[PDB]
Amino acid sequence: NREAILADWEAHPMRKPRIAKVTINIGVGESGERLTKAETMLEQLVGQKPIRRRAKQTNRDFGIRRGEPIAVKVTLRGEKAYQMLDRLLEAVDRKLKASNFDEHGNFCFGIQEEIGIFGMDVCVTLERPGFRVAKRKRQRRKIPTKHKLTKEEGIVFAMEELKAKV
Amino acid sequence: AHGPRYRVPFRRRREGKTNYHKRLKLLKSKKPRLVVRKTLNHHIAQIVVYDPKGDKTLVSAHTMELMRGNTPSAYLLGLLIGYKAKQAGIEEAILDIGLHPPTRGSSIFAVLKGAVDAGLNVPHSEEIYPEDYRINGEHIANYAKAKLPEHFEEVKAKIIEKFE
Amino acid sequence: LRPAKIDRDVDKPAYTRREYIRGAPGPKITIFDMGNLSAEFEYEVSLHAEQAMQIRQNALEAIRIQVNRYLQKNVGRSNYHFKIRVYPFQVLRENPMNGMRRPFGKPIGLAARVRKDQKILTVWVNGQHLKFALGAMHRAKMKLPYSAYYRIYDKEGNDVTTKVLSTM
Amino acid sequence: VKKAHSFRRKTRGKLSKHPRRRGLPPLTRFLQEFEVGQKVHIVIEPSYHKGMPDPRFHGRTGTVVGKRGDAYIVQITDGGKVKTFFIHPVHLRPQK
RNA sequence: GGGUAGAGCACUGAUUGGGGGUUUAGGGGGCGAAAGCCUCCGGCUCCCUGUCAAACUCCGAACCCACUGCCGCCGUAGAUGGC
RNA sequence: GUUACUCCAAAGGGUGUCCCUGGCCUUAGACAGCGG
RNA sequence: GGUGCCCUAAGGUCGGCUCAGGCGGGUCAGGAAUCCGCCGUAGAGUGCAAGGGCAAAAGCCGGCCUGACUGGACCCGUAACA
RNA sequence: GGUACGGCGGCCAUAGCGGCGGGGCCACACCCGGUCUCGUUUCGACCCCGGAAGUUAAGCCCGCCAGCGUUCCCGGGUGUACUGCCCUCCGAGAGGGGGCGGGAAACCGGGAACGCCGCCGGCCA
Secondary structure, eight states: OHHHHHHHHHHOGGGSOEEEEEEEEOOSOOOTTSOOTHHHHHHHHHSSOOBOOBOOSOOSSSOOSSSOBOOOEEEEOHHHHHHHHHHHHHHSOSSBOSTTBOTTSOEEEOOBOOOOOOBOEEEEEEEOTTGGGGTOSTTOOOOOSTTSOOHHHHHHHHHHHHOOBO | OOSTTOOOOOHHHHHTOOOHHHHHHHHHSOSOEEEEEEOSSOEEEEEEEOOTTOOEEEEEEESHHHHOOOHHHHHHHHHHHHHHHTTTTOOOOEEEOTTOOOOSSOHHHHHHHHHHHTTOOOOOOSSSSOOHHHHSSHHHHHHTTOOOHHHHHHHHHHHHHHTO | OOOTTTTSOOOSOOOOOTTTOSSOOOOSOOOOEESOSSOOOSEEEEEEESSOEEEEHHHHHHHHHHHHHHHHHHTOTTSOEEEEOOOOOEEEEEOOOOTTSSOOOEEEEEEEEEOTTOEEEEEEEOGGGHHHHHHHHHHHHTTSSSOEEEEEEETTTEEOHHHHHHOO | OOOOOOTTTTOTTTTOOOTTTOSOOOHHHHTOOOOTTOEEEEOOOTTOOSSOOOGGGTTOEEEEEEEETTEEEEEEEETTEEEEEEEOGGGEEEOO
């Protein structure tokens, strides 16, 4: 809770979290085999080029020609993340929920809306500095439960960052 | 670790320090190894030979024994090791870089270049080194416009003077 | 079908594996527990085999019906936990009769392989129905291919057949 | 039906491992050396497919009579016949 | 060096019943204002109970095989071996 | 029965006789008679 | 129970990475699949049957190549011993 | 002689997995930037380059926990199951018995175990 994250900040700010990253996707996915300028939408929105991601075993909604441009994905770091959050959070409803969250402190939004048709998905995930020793190559090793995140620190971080919750 | 049919890997592989495939390939040669290691702040070099009870080292040297972390320091420590390897009566060795990726233009191969120049026969290519403007120091001195290469020169000639 | 002196011996190898046996049949027997299945009774009347046998499912089902009818008519469902412990796994085969050219039997049925002094079936009861449990024992014994014998078991794992028989 | 002998016939167990070895062997075995006259046990490591003798002769003890490349020359006796094999040191083990 | 007998369920696959939790992959209806908030025959994950394997193995004999040294036997009255 | 083997019939029953055991009775028990 | 083939890559080598499934998060009728995190000894995958083998790989993603060559030698198996 | 420091190894779980508590000259990490070396089918996240304001929180070092998994020991199970050689022993047969030799698996109870060894270095005094 508040006392918790503030007293372990007092302990040290290395225990205070940062923001890991923010990833946008066209989740449902309706490109097909044409040049959807939903990729062009995000170009102007964010300021750097997206990337496709190809389908898998054959389906009906979209993604039958396995190995086919079907959707769009973008991943953002640093200050761009804060800024686009200030944009989209503000855009969308008051009173962020509590069940926005996975049980590590990461949340997701399912928002929607010449060309302007789009139903999008955003996902934000969090971190604290020493999450590197699990993704690094040399002397790799996994994170104990202390240096891991729970639901509280996530929601409190969301509040302090920008929001009020359920 | 969850019962039988679970294979626990070697100590140094669960640690994350040794690559046993590459180790085999290097040991198939019956020649000493010039081992090179890199931290954020120092560089280490050794010359190692094989024993089944445990590898036996013959030589060592260190950037702190220089201070008494960068490409210049790499070259200088290469010079060190190349000049001590002839002291003991061996002019041959093959490069060991463990789990360091082989990018061209790195302090690893700077150590290699130094060891070659200092009179040690290590088989090599000439197109893997870092070029001399990154070696001598023009690179950080060009960055400082937003190690003095004379100092580089002087401690270099100090080493060659010492080991004449 | 054929007599059981053909199939009671245990000298052939085990022949159980369904993913390699083609044309294998299904079990005629489907129920294996009966009565009150939680009542925490006192006495366990169990049958044991004298020597090793192969018991057919036809016989197993005959025993099932006979014994359960006796017990339902003279004890009542709320007592008499009845159980058959052994499932029929071994596949019986017969030679489709040419003559002895290409003799390797086609499947015809199933049996359970029971070893010396191995429990076949059990009836859990209370003090005042032992005689009916023993009647079930005798009815069952009469319908098997080789001989069997019964024991009476207490909680804690003890054999009490001597004295419990004496007092009656 | 009559079936000829081949390299991998009835090798299910003999070229299998216990699942707690499961991988690359340690390197001492790869780097063993031998002298002429030394007795050696023929013990096949099933993860290394070079220098592999016919598994028929797995479990026998022969003598070294030389080297050719990285392989050693091992003689065995089969009945009255003497037979000669070129075996990688990983498939070998010294007596005593 | 080896996986047979025996044994067992740790893999592959078979197999009884109970005590619970998620309920639903799914046709049945019920208060079904209708696939509904909610349940009924059923699927998923446990724990206790009971059964199996010629083409299963966490285990594992007696026994057999090669080799070294010794005891014993054969051999200069010529063996083993070769033509 | 007078059969080592080559070359000998069961499930199920009898306490027919000889034996080893375990419980309930026994200064009056299991009946056998006169009576309630 | 399978074969009487297929591949200029499914062949050679170098580098980097790690799989199936389950759970918790979101748009979706079964949803095939695309997004995020955790667990996870290989349950996956391997040109093809079955068995064996393989995890900083023998699997996935890429880069450069043609040792799928010329001249020769001694060994093992088919066909134990012979 | 000392150091709560590091590199290359061997045996490959009695060493693992997990949990708890403690530490920072030297050192080892995390940390800030990315112009340049190298690169991201998008992100300097990971790989690479440059350096330390700053942190003991993680990794690392140090000590503990018998919770899971693993190996060993004593005793029971039990000389049980199985088995090599001989038998004018039994049994209608199957299948068992006797003598001389070998000898388990599950399970049960009680103990040890939260790594051992080699080579060269660094820093303080």
